[PDB]
Every structure is written in structure tokens, then in C-alpha cells.
Design a binder for this molecule. Structure first.
Ligand SMILES: NC(=O)C1=CN([C@@H]2O[C@H](COP(=O)(O)OP(=O)(O)OC[C@H]3O[C@@H](n4cnc5c(N)ncnc54)[C@H](O)[C@@H]3O)[C@@H](O)[C@H]2O)C=CC1
Ligand SMILES: Cc1cc2nc3c(=O)[nH]c(=O)nc-3n(C[C@H](O)[C@H](O)[C@H](O)COP(=O)(O)O)c2cc1C
Ligand code: SF4
Ligand code: FES
Lengths: 213, 63, 430
């Protein structure tokens, strides 16, 4: 909730951090993805790469990313602070985001949120004391037709019920990984009352083409 | 401890529209005078696109 | 033709929208994609741009600009700089998920559209700005890109025509304001997602200072079908200057929220009663409909009866088409709370570069929170309207206008509910 940093023993420029050589090759490929003279355009994924190295961004990936791309560190600080994906605080092992935007609150996402609160025994933005689950709220995540939904790490869980989300929680606590998909009758985006469209098979190539092509 | 002065003309600043009229008023009262020229600002060249040039050095590092 | 809708499965652009067939190269090429692309690339950029212009395809992002003229803006001789095509796959608009379905189920159609568009305007390479939260969608898109690369369709000597074309996928970092094309250009270059000022247009100075054209996924993926079936085939649908087929994402208090392809000028009532499964509790339970996601003003039941879902009929109903995102609210809703949450979302997604949005969106959030609570004076409601008139038209980008429009629509359509709520609070608390 703070956009300024203060020197802590757990977060300082003297905190040790480095990239693995495979991650160095990935960073080199990311740099080579862009035109010459614009190395700073690689600052967006590479820093995110450092997040996948650690799970959170102290101020040691900031300076390292600034060093390996020949940019000032304040540009990396601006990029990290402007964007909400880059966690500058150590989050739990499973970061849970709940959508509370209007097309998701329309389908009573508050009941799902309260179910998570009464299951994990935490508050909004609080971290579980075993360093496993972090529960915050974000904006629309692109699953409005399958609302309500949550996003755990990099997995979408759509069309959820309180029983569904508590089952996801108690299966995640057991060490297994759930199925990143909607839990209703439909699969991705079709209506639940059967296919209203695209019941006919597709017609294949060479269909309805014009003369001269 | 105030600022006590003995100069009666310390708070005498006059305003003139043009330079030659002020020169005539200076010569009229017999005051030895010196003139500093009007330092007009030079017309700068401003361009919003030059902040996002393809190869020039005038790119903005941040915005 | 007068009755618009009832589109057959033979005219749907995006087969396997529901993910029931294979999304890879062998599945996409069996559904008609990647067919006769070499002749399309060889015929000419002028011919492709003319075929697009005659088709009447307009902006599928929600802006409503004609696609053919905008694509022909960069049809000019070069000055030594490369030219770039960028596909906007952010899709941070609430109520909108169609581009997610396209990039998750038809990636090869998007790649062929990128190739055709880059041939049309002479682009050197293609950049896809995927959303950061769409990690599986981005992985599937890159799998399809690699599968198209190993088949010789793109890269050096793309589709056996001698024209080089490269494609890239760049991930976002969780910012809705990055969906704006100039803020997207700034985000690709490695800065904060803060929009630029037009002029200079992206056709003159875009990403890396190169001439760059940014287009939506839904207006890029239809280009090979546009070239194959012909311009008049796409012009056969809808009204005049409203041609084409549209993906509609219907959600809210609806029995079956879904994404479905339909004709442009279909009535909203027919679509919501046919594909969505009807409003919950019958038609009489319906209270309001937002026709274009969070960027458009809402309309009540008195305007939702005989409204055509195209640009002209919706702009005649003092609202906008948006991204064809139908958010439906029935009579069991706190509508002022919904608009307050939308305004709070706009507050949480605003870059803060330019002053009127940065201050007035926060001011609108405070005013609407007090209105939901009811702790104000009635004349302040009209004052809130004036605040909207100090935001709409005085901003760098259109997020400020996109926040001012729903408040104006809510006030104009449901001032009595607002004033009765706050006078009830004043009576029962003082
Ligand atoms: N698709 C989505 O997810 C979302 C879409 N929107 C919609 O996007 C729109 C705002 O975006 P814009 O691209 O700024 O809309 P619009 O004002 O700018 O312009 C559309 C296109 O025409 C170009 N253009 C505009 N004026 C021009 C001129 N005088 N000469 C040449 N080219 C010109 C722009 O560069 C752009 O590519 C709104 O209609 C809003 O409802 C808003 C939020 C989300
Ligand atoms: C605040 C804001 C956010 C936007 N977000 C998106 C977006 O996420 N996806 C998109 O395709 N267009 C978005 N747009 C619209 C783009 O500016 C532009 O109209 C679109 O990328 C291309 O339009 P076209 O359909 O004519 O090609 C947004 C516009 C604004 C003002
Ligand atoms: S209107 Fe808001 S989001 Fe858009 S440029 Fe201004 S401050 Fe940024
Ligand atoms: S409003 Fe929640 S996913 Fe879009």
C-alpha cells in the first residue's frame, strides 16, 4: 500500500540475488526479440522473469535488471511501482485474486469472498501464517461470461460456488494442483442449455471463395 | 533596529512606455544615465514528436 | 433486407469458438484457415486494402473507426524506417472476453490475419500485446506461432511469396490503461503505460518511432476471411456503414451468460432472449442493460425494447456500442452500488498522467460513495453532472470520457432513485 521503499534487513540493495544461466539465455532471447538501440524495451518481461525467480521483487532484482540492460534504476522502479503484477512484498506460495467488478458482483462474488475468509481465517490483503495463501481483490480478469471467478497463481477458476472454492482450498492444502477450468456444466463459453450456435460441423477449406483468388 | 536611510530617491522608480521617451526624460532632468537593452527571448523550436525519435538522442527516458 | 439476425453456421467467421475442435495447425487448416494465402500475399497490398475498404469493416475495439481507411493511412512510401503492425490483445474492459476466446481457440486465424495485415500496409514485423493474466492463452498462441513457423508459413519467405514477416508476443503487467494504443506503444518500448498525444499519430510516430498501426484481435483475425470470401460477402450483413458479424459477450443477471457470434444489426431483445437464455425472473424483472461494458452509458427497459445493436442506433440512444459487451442488471440489484463499483474500478485503473482524470475520477468516487450511502444534498447530484462536463473532452486519452459517460447515463436515467435514496437516509438518520 506504500509506493516508497525503506531499507529493511529483509529488503535492501545488499540482499543477494542472481539469475541462473538458463535464465540468462532467456533474457538474451528477450533482448534479441527487440530492435537494436532499444534494449530498454526488454525491461518489462525480464523483471517479470525475476519475479518467477523469487515470487516477489525486493530491491535487488531492480538494480540487477537495471545493470544488465544499461538503464537507470529509477526507470525499473517506475515500471515496478506503476504495474500491479510486480509484488514488492513477499506474498504467499499461492496468490489468490478475486474479481469484485460489477459483472462479477452481479453473480454474488461477495459470498465466495466471505467463504474464502471464513475458510482461511484471514482478512482482505492478509497473508496466512503458514506462508501459503494470499487473498487480495482485483479488477476484471476477462472471465465475465463465467463469473464469478478467482485466479490462483497463473490458473483461472471460473463459475465457482462456495463449495467449489472451499474444495479448491482444501485440495490445494493437500499438496495437489486443481484443474484450471470452469466448474459448471459448460466447458469454456457456451451456454449451459446446449449449443445455441455452431451445431453444424465446419465446412472446411475452399468454401465461399471469390473468383480470381 | 529598523532600516534607517538618508537617501530621498531610494523609493523612486518611474515607468516609461518606450526607450527614447525615457532617454529624453533622463536628459531633461540632468541625470547621468545608463541604458540596458531589452533582452527578448529567442524563438525556440519545440516539437512533441522529437521525444519519440527513432534514432536521435532527444528521446525521453521516461514519461 | 429488414430483419437482421438469425445467422447460419455457414456465415460464422470463428468456427471452433467453443473449443470443440482442434486449435492447432492441423485443426485450423482443416477448418479453412491458411488456404490460398500465397495468392493473397502476391496479389497486392493495394488490392487487399481496396477489398477491406469495400467491405465496410469498422473498429472492433469499440472506437468505431473504419478499418480500411485506418489501415490505408500507412500505405505510403518509406523514409528509411521500418513499419510495424501491433495487435491489441489486452482486453481489460469489463464484460468483454471475446478476444480471449479468439486467442485461446483460434490462434492460427490470428496469425494469418497478422500476416495479411502486415502485407496490406507493408509492415516489417508483427507484435502481439497479450494480457499478462492470459498466461495459458499466450502459451497456446506461442505454440501455434511455433507450429506455423516450422511449416514455413511465416518468417523468411513467408507462405512461399518471398515476403519476410516476423511475429512476436509480448506480455503485459496487469494494467487496463495499457489497452489504449498509445499507452500500449509506450508499454512495449519499456516505459510506464502512459498515453501519448495525437498528433503525432501512430501512423507517423509509433513504437520505437517507426510508423506503426495498432488494431484489435477481432479486426485482424477476420482479414483473411475478408480477402477470401470477398468484400460484398461481409457487406451483405447489417445496415449501411454497419456491416459485419460481431462477437457478443452477455453476462450479468442472466440464465446463461455466454459468448456468441451474431449479425451486426440484430435487435438486443432477440439476442438476449435467444442466445443468453433470457433475463432471470422473466422480462419484467429487467432493470437496466449496459451495452458496451464499462465504457458506455446504461439504458433502461424503455429503451431496450426496440434497439438495434449497431453503431448508429446505439449512438442515437445517447449511448455507445462499446465492445459489444452486454451487462444485464435485473430488478434485484442496487444499481447505484453497481455504478459506484464501476467508478471505483476506473479509479483503480487510471494512469494519472493528465490532471482532469487524475483528480475528477477520485472526486467522482467520493461523490458516488456518498450517494450510495445517501449522505449529500440533492443539488449536488446536478453538480456531479457538471463534474462530468469538466472531464469529458479535456483528457489525453479516452478513459476520462469512459468514466464520465456511465455517471451521466446513470444520473439521466435514474435521478429519482438516487434522490429518493438520499432523502430516505436524511429522514431516517436526522
Ligand atoms: N476494446 C476495448 O477493450 C476497449 C475499448 N474502448 C473504446 O475505445 C475508444 C477510445 O479509443 P481510441 O482509439 O482513442 O478511439 P478513437 O478516438 O481514437 O480513434 C480510433 C482510431 O482512429 C485513429 N484516429 C483518431 N482520430 C484520428 C484522426 N484525426 N486522424 C487519423 N486517425 C485518427 C486513432 O489513432 C485510432 O487508431 C472508445 O470508443 C472506447 O469506448 C474503451 C475501453 C476498452
Ligand atoms: C482506456 C482505453 C482502454 C482500451 N483498451 C483496449 C483493449 O483492451 N483492447 C482493444 O482492442 N482496444 C482497447 N482500446 C481501444 C484502442 O484505443 C483502439 O481503439 C483499438 O486498440 C483498435 O481499434 P480498432 O478496432 O479500430 O482496430 C482502449 C481504449 C481506451 C481509451
Ligand atoms: S485520462 Fe486518465 S488514464 Fe487517460 S491519460 Fe489522462 S490520467 Fe491517464
Ligand atoms: S468483471 Fe470479473 S472477470 Fe470481468
Amino acid at each position: 500500500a506504500l509506493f516508497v521503499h525503506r531499507d529493511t534487513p529483509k529488503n535492501n540493495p545488499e540482499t543477494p540475488f542472481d539469475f541462473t544461466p538458463e535464465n540468462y539465455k532467456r533474457i538474451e532471447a528477450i533482448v534479441k526479440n527487440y530492435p537494436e538501440g532499444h534494449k530498454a524495451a526488454a525491461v518489462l518481461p525480464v523483471l517479470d522473469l525475476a519475479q518467477r525467480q523469487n515470487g516477489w521483487l525486493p530491491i535487488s532484482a531492480m538494480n540487477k535488471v537495471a545493470e544488465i540492460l544499461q538503464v537507470p534504476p529509477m526507470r525499473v522502479y517506475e515500471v515496478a511501482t506503476f504495474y500491479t503484477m510486480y509484488n514488492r512484498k513477499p506474498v504467499g506460495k499461492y496468490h489468490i485474486q478475486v474479481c469484485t467488478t460489477t459483472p462479477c458482483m452481479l453473480r454474488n462474488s461477495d459470498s465466495i469472498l466471505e467463504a474464502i475468509q471464513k475458510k482461511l481465517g484471514i482478512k482482505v490483503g492478509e497473508t496466512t501464517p503458514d506462508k501459503l495463501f494470499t487473498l487480495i481483490e482485483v479488477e476484471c480478469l476477462g472471465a465475465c461470461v463465467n463469473a464469478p471467478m478467482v485466479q490462483i497463481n497463473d490458473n483461472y477458476y471460473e463459475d465457482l460456488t462456495p463449495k467449489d472454492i472451499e474444495e479448491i482450498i482444501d485440495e490445494l492444502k493437500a499438496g495437489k494442483i486443481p484443474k484450471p477450468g470452469p466448474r459448471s456444466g459448460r466447458f469454456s463459453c457456451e451456454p449451459a442449455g446446449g449449443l445455441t450456435s455452431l451445431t453444424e460441423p465446419p465446412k472446411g477449406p475452399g468454401f465461399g471463395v471469390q473468383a480470381g483468388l | 533596529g529598523w532600516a534607517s536611510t538618508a537617501d530621498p530617491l531610494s523609493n523612486l522608480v518611474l515607468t516609461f512606455s518606450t526607450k527614447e521617451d525615457a532617454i529624453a526624460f533622463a536628459e531633461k532632468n540632468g541625470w547621468s544615465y545608463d541604458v540596458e537593452e531589452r533582452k527578448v527571448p529567442k524563438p525556440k523550436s519545440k516539437s512533441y514528436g522529437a521525444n519519440f525519435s527513432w534514432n536521435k538522442r532527444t528521446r525521453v527516458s521516461t514519461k | 433486407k429488414t430483419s437482421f439476425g438469425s445467422l447460419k453456421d455457414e456465415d460464422r467467421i470463428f468456427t471452433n469458438l467453443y473449443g470443440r475442435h482442434d486449435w492447432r495447425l492441423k485443426g485450423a487448416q482443416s477448418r479453412g484457415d491458411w488456404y490460398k494465402t500465397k495468392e493473397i500475399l502476391l496479389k497486392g497490398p493495394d488490392w487487399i486494402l481496396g477489398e477491406v475498404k469495400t467491405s465496410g469493416l469498422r473498429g472492433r475495439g469499440g472506437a468505431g473507426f473504419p478499418t480500411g481507411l485506418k489501415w490505408s493511412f500507412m500505405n505510403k512510401p518509406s523514409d528509411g524506417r521500418p513499419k510495424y503492425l501491433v495487435v491489441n490483445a489486452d482486453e481489460g474492459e469489463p464484460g468483454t472476453c471475446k478476444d480471449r476466446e479468439i486467442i485461446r481457440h483460434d490462434p492460427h486465424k490470428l496469425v494469418e490475419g497478422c500476416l495479411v495485415g502486415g502485407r496490406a500496409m507493408g509492415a516489417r514485423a508483427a507484435y502481439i500485446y497479450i494480457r499478462g493474466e492470459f498466461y495459458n492463452e499466450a502459451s497456446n498462441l506461442q505454440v501455434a506461432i511455433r507450429e506455423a513457423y516450422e511449416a514455413g508459413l511465416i518468417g523468411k519467405n513467408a507462405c512461399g511469396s518471398g515476403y519476410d514477416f516476423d511475429v512476436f508476443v509480448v506480455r503485459g503487467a496487469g494494467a487496463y490503461i495499457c489497452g489504449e494504443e498509445t499507452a500500449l506503444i509506450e508499454s512495449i518500448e519499456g516505459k510506464q503505460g502512459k498515453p501519448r498525444l495525437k498528433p503525432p499519430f501512430p501512423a507517423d510516430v509509433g513504437v520505437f518511432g517507426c510508423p506503426t498501426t495498432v488494431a484489435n484481435v477481432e479486426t485482424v483475425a477476420v482479414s483473411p476471411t475478408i480477402c477470401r470470401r470477398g468484400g460484398a460477402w461481409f457487406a451483405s450483413f447489417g445496415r449501411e456503414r454497419n456491416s459485419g458479424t460481431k462477437l457478443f459477450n452477455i453476462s450479468g443477471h442472466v440464465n446463461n451468460p455466454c459468448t456468441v457470434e451474431e449479425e451486426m444489426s440484430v435487435p438486443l431483445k432477440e439476442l438476449i432472449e435467444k442466445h443468453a437464455g433470457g433475463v432471470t425472473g422473466g422480462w419484467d424483472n429487467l432493470l437496466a442493460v449496459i451495452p458496451g461494458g464499462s465504457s458506455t452509458p446504461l439504458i433502461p427497459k424503455s429503451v431496450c425494447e426496440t434497439v438495434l445493436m449497431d453503431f448508429d442506433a446505439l449512438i442515437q440512444a445517447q449511448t455507445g456500442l462499446g465492445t459489444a459487451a452486454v451487462i444485464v442488471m435485473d430488478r434485484s440489484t442496487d444499481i447505484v452500488k453497481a455504478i459506484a463499483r464501476l467508478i471505483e474500478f476506473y479509479k483503480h485503473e487510471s494512469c494519472g498522467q493528465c490532471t482532469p482524470c487524475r483528480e475528477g475520477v477520485d472526486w467522482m468516487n467520493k461523490v458516488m460513495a456518498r450517494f450510495v450511502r445517501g449522505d449529500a444534498r440533492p443539488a449536488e447530484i446536478d453538480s456531479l453532472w457538471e463534474i462530468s462536463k469538466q472531464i469529458e473532452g479535456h483528457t489525453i486519452c479516452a478513459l476520462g470520457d469512459g468514466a464520465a459517460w456511465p455517471v451521466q447515463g446513470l444520473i439521466r436515467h435514474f435521478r429519482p432513485e438516487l434522490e429518493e435514496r438520499m432523502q430516505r437516509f436524511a429522514q431516517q438518520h436526522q
